[PDB]
Structure 1
Amino acid sequence: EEFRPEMLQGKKVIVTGASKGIGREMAYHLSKMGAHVVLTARSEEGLQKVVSRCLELGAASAHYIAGTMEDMTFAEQFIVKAGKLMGGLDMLILNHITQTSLSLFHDDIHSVRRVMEVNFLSYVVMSTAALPMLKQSNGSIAVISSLAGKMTQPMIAPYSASKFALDGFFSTIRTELYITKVNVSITLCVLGLIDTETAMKEISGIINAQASPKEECALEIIKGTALRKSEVYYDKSPLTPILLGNPGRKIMEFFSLRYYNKDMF
């Protein structure tokens, strides 16, 4: 199937980490598509600014809920308030991440605990809290990851862990949903370097690599999620999907089901 921006006309969509970066570019894109949007981040001020440009762009409705995804209760509550506000949920975009600086891992157990709580746990809390509305609407989940969630690079050990943890968790859910004949899709978005101000500031004096436009990235995420693709690759190199694709895993995963007692699902 080929994408049409009409696929998101009047659809109820949640976007995390929407104050800046890819989250913001996705909000703007959904707006132009005529969708109902609910945004989140910590900065109330930041959210207000994008929520204003959202309606200005063509959003069917635009609202925001400020808060920290470090707090699991907020993550669960944000989903319910947003579900009420839009009268259901069609697409859930899981984008937010806690601050990460590129440094060779020395210690800081609490930094690693924060990373897994924000980057990983909140995503499971939020997806669990959203799954009934998504079940009704036969909707989707966009799980934002990176190349570092499919492969290893130095100076991002806790970050890689959180992104790998998502792959394990959500790919399992995706299979479970499929085998229990539930039409809710899970789209894992594997991204390369994106030209967001935050990344550029963080790689300055460490990584040489060329970034990709945040506008084209955001659109590709929405496109793939709506087109109900299991995984979406967006990087400067055209070999990234061939190299990171893991067909062997796909084969292995398929035959695993053969050993299961069919009564289980």
Structure 2
Amino acid sequence: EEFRPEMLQGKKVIVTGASKGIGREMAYHLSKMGAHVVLTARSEEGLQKVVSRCLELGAASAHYIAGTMEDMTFAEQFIVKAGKLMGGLDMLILNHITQTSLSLFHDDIHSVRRVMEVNFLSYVVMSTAALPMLKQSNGSIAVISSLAGKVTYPMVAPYSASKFALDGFFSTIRTELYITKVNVSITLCVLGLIDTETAMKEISGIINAQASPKEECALEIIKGTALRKSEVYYDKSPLTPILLGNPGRKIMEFFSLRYYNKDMF
């Protein structure tokens, strides 16, 4: 199977954290493809500027709804309004995250809660809210993760916890949808260091690593989701997907389905 940019033409897409970074790039690529987009972030001004640009680039439609995704009530209402604006939903790109600084974890419990609320819990709310619309259209979900969601790094404990949680939850949901013959895809995008202004500011003085371009990154996510792939990998090193392949877990998960009573599906 090969990606064609006509696959997203006319499709109704939602992009979280669309005001800047990879989300903003994803917004532009979808707009060039002639899709319907509803964007979100906290910054009202930031969204307005991106929505304007999306129209110029050639979006079928384009709207913004501003708010914080630490509010679960907002997260649920956002999906419902997004769906009302576009008349349905075809793709859900859960891309947003709460701010995190690189530091050794030290007596930082209220921060951990906040990270789980924004980086993980809201993802569950929005997927749950959006699922009925994605069932109706046989749609997709883009679950944007990290290398730190598969392997561990110092000075990023709460961030990893959340992204690991995303791998646990959405990999399970994916299987359930598959074994129950529900035609909705879930994509876990494992990303290496990307040259977004927030990331580069953060790794400054601490980490000495080469970043990858944010434009090309945004495109691969959109392609990977559109082609209904289980996982997508994006990193500078070509050794990454092989070292993060984990054939044992794949073997484990396949044979494990025989333990179950098929009557449950």
Taking structure 2 as the reference length, the TM-score comes to 1.00
Counterpart secondary structure, 1:6: coil
Deviation per CA, 1:24-48: give whole Å up to 9, x if none.
0000000000000000000000000
Structure 2 distance, partners of 1:107, 1:73, is 29
Deviation per CA, 1:102-122: give whole Å up to 9, x if none.
000001211000000000000
Match for residue 250 of structure 1?
250
Deviation per CA, 1:126-146: give whole Å up to 9, x if none.
000000000000000000000
Deviation per CA, 1:188-231: give whole Å up to 9, x if none.
00000000000000000011000000000000000000000000
Structure 1 distance, partners of 2:107, 2:119, is 19
Structure 2 distance, partners of 1:255, 1:248, is 11
Deviation for aligned residue 1:54: 0.3
Percent of matched pairs sharing the same residue = 99
Unaligned runs of 5+ in 2: none
Structure 2 distance, partners of 1:64, 1:241, is 35
Deviation for aligned residue 1:245: 1.0
Deviation per CA, 1:36-90: give whole Å up to 9, x if none.
0000000000000000000000100000000000000100000000000000000
Question: Runs ≥4 in structure 1, deviation > 3 angstroms?
Answer: none
Counterpart secondary structure, 2:194: coil
Match for residue 79 of structure 2?
79
Structure 2 distance, partners of 1:109, 1:264, is 39
Structure 1 distance, partners of 2:245, 2:209, is 21
Structure 2 distance, partners of 1:236, 1:175, is 30
Structure 2 distance, partners of 1:77, 1:261, is 37
Deviation for aligned residue 1:16: 0.3
Counterpart secondary structure, 1:8: coil
Taking structure 1 as the reference length, the TM-score comes to 1.00
Match for residue 214 of structure 1?
214
Structure 1 distance, partners of 2:75, 2:239, is 36
Structure 1 distance, partners of 2:133, 2:125, is 14
Write the mapping of 1:163-174 to structure 2, written as runs, cut at 5 A: 163-174=163-174
Match for residue 48 of structure 2?
48
Structure 1 distance, partners of 2:247, 2:15, is 30
Q: Count the aligned residue pairs.
A: 265
Structure 1 distance, partners of 2:232, 2:100, is 23
Structure 2 distance, partners of 1:34, 1:107, is 48
Match for residue 181 of structure 2?
181
Match for residue 259 of structure 1?
259
Counterpart secondary structure, 1:45: helix
Match for residue 6 of structure 1?
6
Structure 1 distance, partners of 2:222, 2:175, is 21
